[PDB]
From Swiss-Prot, chain A:
Disease as annotated in the protein's UniProt record: Leukemia, chronic myeloid: A clonal myeloproliferative disorder of a pluripotent stem cell with a specific cytogenetic abnormality, the Philadelphia chromosome (Ph), involving myeloid, erythroid, megakaryocytic, B-lymphoid, and sometimes T-lymphoid cells, but not marrow fibroblasts.
PTM per Swiss-Prot/TrEMBL: Polyubiquitinated. Polyubiquitination of ABL1 leads to degradation.
Protein name (Swiss-Prot/TrEMBL): Tyrosine-protein kinase ABL1
Span within the parent record: 122 to 219 of 1130
Compartments reported by the entry: Cytoplasm, Cytoskeleton; Nucleus; Mitochondrion
Origin organism lineage: Eukaryota, Metazoa, Chordata, Craniata, Vertebrata
Modified residues (Phosphotyrosine): 7, 18, 51, 64, 94
Tissue specificity as recorded in UniProt: Widely expressed.
Domain of life: Eukaryota
Function: Non-receptor tyrosine-protein kinase that plays a role in many key processes linked to cell growth and survival such as cytoskeleton remodeling in response to extracellular stimuli, cell motility and adhesion, receptor endocytosis, autophagy, DNA damage response and apoptosis. Coordinates actin remodeling through tyrosine phosphorylation of proteins controlling cytoskeleton dynamics like WASF3 (involved in branch formation); ANXA1 (involved in membrane anchoring); DBN1, DBNL, CTTN, RAPH1 and ENAH (involved in signaling); or MAPT and PXN (microtubule-binding proteins).
Family of the protein in this entry: Belongs to the protein kinase superfamily. Tyr protein kinase family. ABL subfamily.
Amino acid sequence: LEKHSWYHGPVSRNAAEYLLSSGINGSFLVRESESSPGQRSISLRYEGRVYHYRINTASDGKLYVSSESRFNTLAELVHHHSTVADGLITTLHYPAPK
Amino acid sequence: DVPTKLEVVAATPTSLLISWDAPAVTVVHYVITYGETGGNSPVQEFTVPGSKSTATISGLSPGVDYTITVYALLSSSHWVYESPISINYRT
């Protein structure tokens, strides 16, 4: 859903690291693979470092980063992870510039 | 030299977004504690980098009065933090 400020669409692991390079703790983006669109990941800045998390899909189709917290839509998953880290190194707050 | 303006920016039923104004001088890091006001229960401790002026707190219990305290560490050579700044918040 490229309408969201945090959804960057087809961007690479390496480009994500450049896009986050001047961010702070909690700067993040969600990205798609540029070869296989459908593999989506979260890249998240924390203390100078960028962490990458594959967004997994469950049997019933729900999206999750942690088994215990699964959502119908990607916006719901991001919104949840803005209030509880729940598996991530920190909470999601500041979209990387596009 | 103390941090100021500690507040709850926003709250869900179980988590809080807090902020404060940093002292003008270098802060090495912050220690933030939270636990029940007057509660004879374990106060939780966590840390925040000296360049941050916000944090989140999660896994809170509904209907509890929490005391939230920020200690700024202003020195690398001795580990005595500043005077605590405190607020109360009822979930």
